[PDB]
Amino acid sequence: CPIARSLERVGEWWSILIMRDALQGLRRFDEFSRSLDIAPNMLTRRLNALVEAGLLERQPYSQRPLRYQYVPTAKGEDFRVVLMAFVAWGNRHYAQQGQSVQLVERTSGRPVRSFMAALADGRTVPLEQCTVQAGPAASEEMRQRL
Amino acid sequence: CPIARSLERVGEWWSILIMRDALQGLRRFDEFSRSLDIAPNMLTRRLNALVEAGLLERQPYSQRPRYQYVPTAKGEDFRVVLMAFVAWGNRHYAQQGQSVQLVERTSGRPVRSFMAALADGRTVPLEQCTVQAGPAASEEMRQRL
Ligand code: NA
Ligand code: NA
Numbered sequence: 628c629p630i631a632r633s634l635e636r637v638g639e640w641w642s643i644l645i646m647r648d649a650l651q652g653l654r655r656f657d658e659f660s661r662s663l664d665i666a667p668n669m670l671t672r673r674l675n676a677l678v679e680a681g682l683l684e685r686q687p688y689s690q691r692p693l694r695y696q697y698v699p700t701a702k703g704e705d706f707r708v709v710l711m712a713f714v715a716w717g718n719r720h721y722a723q724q725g726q727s728v729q730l731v732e733r734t735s736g737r738p739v740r741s742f743m744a745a746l747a748d749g750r751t752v753p754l755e756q757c758t759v760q761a762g763p764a765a766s767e768e769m770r771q772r773l
Numbered sequence: 774c775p776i777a778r779s780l781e782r783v784g785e786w787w788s789i790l791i792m793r794d795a796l797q798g799l800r801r802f803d804e805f806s807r808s809l810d811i812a813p814n815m816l817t818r819r820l821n822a823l824v825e826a827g828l829l830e831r832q833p834y835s836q837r838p839r840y841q842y843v844p845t846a847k848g849e850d851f852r853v854v855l856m857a858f859v860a861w862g863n864r865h866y867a868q869q870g871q872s873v874q875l876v877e878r879t880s881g882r883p884v885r886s887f888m889a890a891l892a893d894g895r896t897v898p899l900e901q902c903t904v905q906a907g908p909a910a911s912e913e914m915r916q917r918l
Binding site for chain 1: 774777779782783784789790793808809810825826827828846847850851852853854855856857858859860861864865868869870871872873874875876877878879882883884885886887888889890891892893895896897899901902903904905906907908909910911913914916917918
């Protein structure tokens with residue numbers, strides 16, 4: 628479908644699906660395989676890359692054969708925002724009826740129109756109104772890059 | 774540097790820096806090279822990957838011997854992802870410890886978090902949203918979700 632294609636093109640589709648399932652409690656290689664309908668060799672490469680990226684950590688599960696489960700890391704827990712963003716990105720310019728994947732309010736089924744930025748004072752502004760800039764701790768090199 | 778390192782582990786640091794430059798009007802190879810202080814092989818790898826991902830488009834600049842790279846509509850939309858990666862990388866850094874910051878452009882005011890504006894006019898924490906199957910999902914897709 629269109630959002631899978633965009634997300635594959637940008638290299639995040641499987642990471643999004645696996646991270647999502649890991650954050651929902653899936654742990655064992657076979658859980659991932661059956662639930663995501665993904666071939667083993669590819670599941671393995673994608674798990675290892677999530678691990679190398681520091682988003683999941685492998686932890687012993689059993690002895691003979693020694694098998695591992697995959698549990699999210701504090702970073703991976705935080706990565707939820709990024710995954711959600713990739714979907715809002717992928718759904719940009721697609722009408723809601725028709726969408727195969729949606730960012731919604733978990734309580735109702737209410738779809739998310741857009742991300743907003745919450746400032747310290749209470750106010751919410753659109754992202755178009757925000758910018759990436761150098762921070763107080765930034766080196767000379769960082770300042771130049773920004 | 775801390776944030777650069779986490780963002781590099783996730784394969785996005787140079788992408789963030791290049792897209793932001795492109796979104797700001799940098800076009801040519803040496804512009805990115807000097808502004809970002811990036812070596813040419815790395816820059817070639819990253820520019821090509823951004824083109825291949827459909828985020829930048831490469832157009833002809835000159836004969837003997839150059840291209841320019843302009844953001845695509847998908848690339849303009851990518852802002853939210855770049856900003857989300859920065860918020861992610863700043864999660865757990867108190868403000869005075871940050872080298873890269875997400876701020877309101879008008880004032881220097883730091884962005885504390887993202888919220889979600891909903892269809893019914895409400896705005897809730899992103900922490901309260903979820904990715905789920907949409908109305909058009911195939912059978913395969915509903916299983917994946
Ligand atoms: Na993918
Ligand atoms: Na990188």
